[PDB]
Amino acid sequence: WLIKEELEEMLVEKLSDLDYMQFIRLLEKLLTSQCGAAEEEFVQRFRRSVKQLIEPVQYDEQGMAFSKSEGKRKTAKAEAIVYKHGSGRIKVNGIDYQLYFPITQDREQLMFPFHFVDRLGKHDVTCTVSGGGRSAQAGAIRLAMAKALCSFVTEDEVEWMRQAGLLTTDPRVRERKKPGQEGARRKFTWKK
């Protein structure tokens, strides 16, 4: 159902909350009364509507079939290229992933997308990442790899990855420090 503001805009008038509730209850009674199309269109006048796009497969000079995508996390931006056929090799900035990511947590984060759809060792990945720290770069590469791999898994697997959070871009970024307080939220020591 449209909100009270939408109803007021439609009727170019001002209505109270109780009037809106009365009208909504009347509309619900109309819907539950096995109303025909002549009334279903009337209902749809007051109805308001509430999937991830996938990049297409491309081809390179070498003849391999691949997809390319990108992602970001905090202040790090990464671009990933995933080939349809590979051997699990991932090279970040021209460096092998186990050398560019000595931390095991980052390597686990990189493994997470392919492991979720059960495709470890079935692809080859080349990533270019810039900015942020080790974990931000790992997260950006993870998001880019998942977005690119969406071009090779089935739609059901795409929906499963979306439900697993592999495709949502993490909006959590550093909050700015404000004047009069130590940090983003840390106030100064309240004297007495």
Partner: protein, 85 residues
Amino acid sequence: KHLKFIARTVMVQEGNVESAYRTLNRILTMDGLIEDIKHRRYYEKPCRRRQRESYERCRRIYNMEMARKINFLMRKNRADPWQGC
């Protein structure tokens, strides 16, 4: 001077002594004997007794009138037949 075990006597039924005691207590309450027993512990002065009796009569009349009014108006409490108008 009266015969014993006739007044305020309740026979127990299949040994439910608790139930028999509750029945006897209810009988005493309904007959007002408990009220008299507890109010005769201390002397209630006649003016206080008259005030209490008048207040009790007024409260009973008011409660009966309120209950009758609520019962009479309860019929209107049905579902709204003219919803939207």
